[PDB]
Amino acid sequence: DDFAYLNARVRVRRGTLLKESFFQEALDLSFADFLRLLSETVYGGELAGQGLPDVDRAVLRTQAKLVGDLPRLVTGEAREAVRLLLLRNDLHNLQALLRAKATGRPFEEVLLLPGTLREEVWRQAYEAQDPAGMAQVLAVPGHPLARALRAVLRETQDLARVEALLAKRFFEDVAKAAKGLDQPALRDYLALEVDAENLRTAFKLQGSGLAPDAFFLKGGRFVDRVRFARLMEGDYAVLDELSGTPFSGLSGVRDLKALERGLRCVLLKEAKKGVQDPLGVGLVLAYVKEREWEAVRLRLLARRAYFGLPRAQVEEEVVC
């Protein structure tokens, strides 16, 4: 692993990073003009659809070539970084397959995202009835965690553990275990991903009365045990108790839309730290992550341009 060597060779593709100044031209086009903006470069010959499956093809064919296959393009530690992304896509296709699989929908109606398992793995993963088949499919590519999930699915498939054991259990250890890399920026970024998963779950259930002080999961970056519980109780005072971290200024903040806007900005700023890193995924991390957050907002703006949505009517939700 590392990317600094491919980076200087890849910066040739970074010539297509578009920041706010791109998005400002796009918000003002008719749906046909938006189609031109993208067509005025190399992407113009890959756009050819209107719904999710159409936008996906434009993102898929490109992302497939720069991200989807990246695990084969790096070695050592860097290979683990991209390799983890694909393993997370196995969760997409599994969650999506489990929900349909429960009743016998054909495979031809499911979308598969490129991940750690070959396209033919999913076609077989679905095909296996017992947890060995589902797990063996995950392990055929020598995946050391696939073999671990085998023992769990052989013994338990209840929906709560599956939803968690795949990630919870895979990310519970992975998250804090991941600190075993020499990636000072990633160590901080991952901790924030855990904080968000705990916060999103805690926020969503707020107002019930739970005593989360037993179920707290360490591994984050700035979120504490009794605050995590209090916040889930609806006492927003947790947002006023964060002195001593980057989130302290939130003291008094009140509302998810503003939180989520704040969190997205933190994760982007953390990805930016790697621009001058000599070793490790620092600069590449910024490349993949900026491509994500860029894709999220690009695909959405295509829709605003086509249907003619107000720009400031909805930007609060899509900014940090």
**What CATH number is given to the structural domain containing 163?**
1.20.1690.10
CA distances from 281 to 2, 182, 193 (A): 5, 9, 17
Give how many domains the chain has, as a whole number. Answer: 3
Domain boundary among 279, 295, 311: 279
Q: Are residues 97 and 61 in the same domain?
A: no
Q: Are 20 and 28 a contacting pair, CB within 8 Å? A: no
Q: Whose structure tokens read 């999220």? A: 296
Q: Are 213 and 225 a contacting pair, CB within 8 Å? A: yes
- Residue partners of 253: CB distance under 8 A and separation at least 6: 239, 259, 262
Q: Are residues 64 and 121 in the same domain?
A: no
Give the separation between CA 183 and CA 281, rounded to whole angstroms: 7
Q: Are residues 204 and 262 in the same domain?
A: yes
Using a 10 angstrom Cβ sphere, with 0-12 exposed, 13-18 middle and 19 or more buried, the burial of residue 76 is: exposed
Q: Are 242 and 251 a contacting pair, CB within 8 Å? A: yes
Q: Are residues 275 and 290 in the same domain?
A: no
- Pair of tokens at residue 111: 């979308």
Q: Are residues 194 and 231 in the same domain?
A: yes
Q: Are residues 148 and 90 in the same domain?
A: yes
Q: What was the experiment behind these coordinates?
A: cryo-EM
Q: Are residues 152 and 196 in the same domain?
A: no
Q: Are residues 169 and 245 in the same domain?
A: no
- Kindly provide the resolution of this structure in angstroms, with one decimal: 9.7
Give the separation between CA 298 and CA 302, rounded to whole angstroms: 6
Domain boundary among 158, 176, 194: 176
**SS3 sequence of the chain:** CCCHHHHHHHHHHHCCCCCHHHHHHHHCCCHHHHHHHHHCCCHHHCCCCCCHHHHHHHHHHHHHHHHHCHHHCCCHHHHHHHHHHHHHHHHHHHHHHHHHHCCCCCHHHCCCCCCCCCHHHHHHHCCCCCHHHHHHHHHCCCCHHHHHHHHHHHHCCCHHHHHHHHHHHHHHHHHHHHHHCCCHHHHHHHHHHHHHHHHHHHHHCCCCCCCHHHCCCCCCCCCCHHHHHHHHCCCHHHHHCCCCCCCHHHCCCCCHHHHHHHHHHHHHHHHHHHHHCCCCCHHHHHHHHHHHHHHHHHHHHHHHHHHCCCCCCCCHHHCC
Helices 282-307 and 184-204: angle between axes, nearest 10 degrees: 40
- Pair of tokens at residue 277: 């890193």
Q: Are residues 127 and 159 in the same domain?
A: yes
Residue-range definition of the domain harbouring residue 126 = 76-176
**What CATH number is given to the structural domain containing 302?**
1.10.132.50
Give the separation between CA 17 and CA 268, rounded to whole angstroms: 14
Domain boundary among 156, 176, 196: 176
Residue 133, amino acid: G
Q: Are residues 261 and 275 in the same domain?
A: yes
Give the separation between CA 257 and CA 316, rounded to whole angstroms: 8
Q: What is the CA radius of gyration of the chain?
A: 21
